[PDB]
Design a protein around this ligand. Structure first.
Ligand SMILES: [Fe+3]
Length: 186
C-alpha cells in the first residue's frame, strides 16, 4: 500500500520500507518519489551549493540499501556523461529544471558519442536511469535559476565512469560528498 509521502522524512521512512527486501520495484519507487511535493524548508539543510560545480549532499544511507542525496546545481553547472555502476538511479527535481541527455554505450572503436535524445526535467518530476537503458549527462542550463535534485541509487556506489564525448573513452571517477547529514565534509 503506497501512500503519499507527507514530508521528506516521511518519504525516507517509506523508502526504507520499499528497500526492506533484496529487489527493487522501480515503478513503485518512482511513483512515491514523484508523489512527494518538494518542500524547500524540509531540505534546506542539505542544499549546500559550491560556486564552481554541482555538489552532492548525502541525506540518508538507506540502512545500506541505497544512497539518498541532494545535488545542488549552480547556474550552468552540469555533469559528465556517466554510467551508474550497475545500480538503479532515480532523479527527482526539487527546484528548477535540468536537461537530461541520453547516450548509448560506446563501441570499442573511438568515435564521437552522439546523443540519442534529450529532455527537460521539471520541478517535482522523477526520472529513472540504469546502465541497461544507457548513459546520460545532467545539466542545469539556466542562467538565472539554481537547481536542486534528489537522487536515489541502489545499491549505493562510490565510483562510476565519465565518458569523453569525442571518443567514448571512459575513466573511473570517485564520487565525493560535499556534506553528509547536513555537515560539511571536506
Ligand atoms: Fe546520472
Amino acid at each position: 500500500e503506497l501512500l503519499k509521502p507527507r514530508t521528506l522524512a516521511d518519504l525516507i521512512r517509506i523508502l526504507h520500507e520499499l528497500f526492506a527486501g533484496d529487489e527493487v520495484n522501480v515503478e513503485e519507487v518512482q511513483a512515491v518519489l514523484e508523489a512527494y511535493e518538494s518542500n524547500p524548508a524540509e531540505w534546506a539543510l542539505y542544499a549546500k551549493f559550491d560556486q564552481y560545480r554541482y555538489t552532492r549532499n548525502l541525506v540518508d544511507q538507506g540502512n545500506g540499501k541505497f544512497n539518498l542525496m541532494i545535488l545542488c546545481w549552480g547556474e550552468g553547472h552540469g555533469s559528465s556523461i556517466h554510467d551508474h555502476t550497475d545500480s538503479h538511479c532515480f532523479l527527482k527535481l526539487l527546484q528548477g529544471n535540468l536537461k537530461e541527455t541520453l547516450f548509448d554505450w560506446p563501441d570499442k572503436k573511438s568515435n564521437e558519442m552522439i546523443k540519442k535524445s534529450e529532455r527537460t526535467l521539471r520541478e517535482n518530476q522523477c526520472a529513472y536511469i540504469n546502465d541497461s537503458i544507457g548513459l546520460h549527462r545532467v545539466e542545469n542550463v539556466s542562467h538565472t535559476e539554481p537547481a536542486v535534485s534528489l537522487h536515489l541509487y541502489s545499491p549505493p556506489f562510490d565510483t562510476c565512469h565519465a565518458f569523453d564525448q569525442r571518443t567514448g573513452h571512459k575513466n573511473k571517477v570517485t564520487m565525493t560528498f560535499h556534506s553528509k547529514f547536513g555537515i560539511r565534509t571536506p
